[PDB]
Amino acid sequence: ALNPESADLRALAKHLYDSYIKSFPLTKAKARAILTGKTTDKSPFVIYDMNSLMMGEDKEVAIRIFQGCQFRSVEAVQEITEYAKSIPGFVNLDLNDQVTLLKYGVHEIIYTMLASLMNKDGVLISEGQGFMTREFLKSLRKPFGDFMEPKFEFAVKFNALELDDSDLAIFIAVIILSGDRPGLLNVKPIEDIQDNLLQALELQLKLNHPESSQLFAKLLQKMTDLRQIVTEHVQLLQVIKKTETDMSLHPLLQEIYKD
Numbered sequence: 001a002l003n004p005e006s007a008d009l010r011a012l013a014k015h016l017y018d019s020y021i022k023s024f025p026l027t028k029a030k031a032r033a034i035l036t037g038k039t040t041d042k043s044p045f046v047i048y049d050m051n052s053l054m055m056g057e058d059k060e061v062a063i064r065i066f067q068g069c070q071f072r073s074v075e076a077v078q079e080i081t082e083y084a085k086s087i088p089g090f091v092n093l094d095l096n097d098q099v100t101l102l103k104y105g106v107h108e109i110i111y112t113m114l115a116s117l118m119n120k121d122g123v124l125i126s127e128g129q130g131f132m133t134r135e136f137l138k139s140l141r142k143p144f145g146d147f148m149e150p151k152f153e154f155a156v157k158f159n160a161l162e163l164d165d166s167d168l169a170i171f172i173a174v175i176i177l178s179g180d181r182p183g184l185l186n187v188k189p190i191e192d193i194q195d196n197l198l199q200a201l202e203l204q205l206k207l208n209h210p211e212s213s214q215l216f217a218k219l220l221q222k223m224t225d226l227r228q229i230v231t232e233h234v235q236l237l238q239v240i241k242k243t244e245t246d247m248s249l250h251p252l253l254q255e256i257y258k259d
């Protein structure tokens with residue numbers, strides 16, 4: 001009994017999933033397959049101590065690792081940015097609002113997808129070839145040992161929803177196209193787009209998780225969690241700025257944070 005109205009939403013869902021697969025080299029599906037011994041050819045090298053770290057590379061630890069994450073983030077911003085362009089209506093919006101939606105949405109999206117590469121013990125690195133334990137990270141020199149812990153806590157709770165890539169594709173689209181962003185010139189156009197995006201997600205979740213009662217509301221509530229993650233990460237950098245005057249925060253990343 002898929003009426004003609006709902007039929008339009010499915011088409012949107014498929015389009016986004018398609019652009020999602022095409023913009024992100026390491027999907028949750030692949031991540032899970034690596035993480036759960038579902039292989040012998042895609043198993044990762046593990047880093048849990050200083051020795052394994054150096055035995056893993058095939059300037060100091062804490063700093064070297066931080067610069068690393070910096071490189072990746074910027075790469076992610078680039079991937080998320082290319083995904084944005086595929087969202088119907090996004091490029092058609094005011095150029096300025098396009099920049100605002102990205103600057104405010106990029107990190108909320110990065111933490112959402114990061115969960116895909118995490119389990120309670122650690123996180124995949126280098127496109128899945130490596131796996132760095134939570135303990136190792138939670139032990140790095142202060143205050144770097146506090147950088148990852150908050151994301152892990154999100155991940156663990158967030159992964160309980162058991163969402164797959166097709167679900168995520170729409171969710172992250174909903175995140176970007178949010179009219180309540182600071183400095184938006186024309187909120188209306190943006191809200192019209194989020195409206196059917198939320199309509200797409202709801203059907204998507206409905207059909208794909210017929211048993212999960214109120215999955216739509218549970219997922220939307222998680223959006224609060226992402227926000228706090230961003231908030232405290234920000235003041236964390238402010239500290240790193242002061243304590244490490246010789247460390248360089250990538251310009252692209254520095255531009256996103258003037259908010």
Ligand SMILES: CC/C=C\C/C=C\C/C=C\C/C=C\C/C=C\C/C=C\CCC(=O)O
Nearest residue numbers: 065068069072073114123124125126127253
């Ligand atoms: C361990 C670093 C070395 C290589 C990186 C390879 C893959 C990266 C994947 C996971 C690494 C762990 C965290 C990085 C993920 C997101 C960035 C973390 C915080 C955001 C920092 C920011 O953008 O300000």
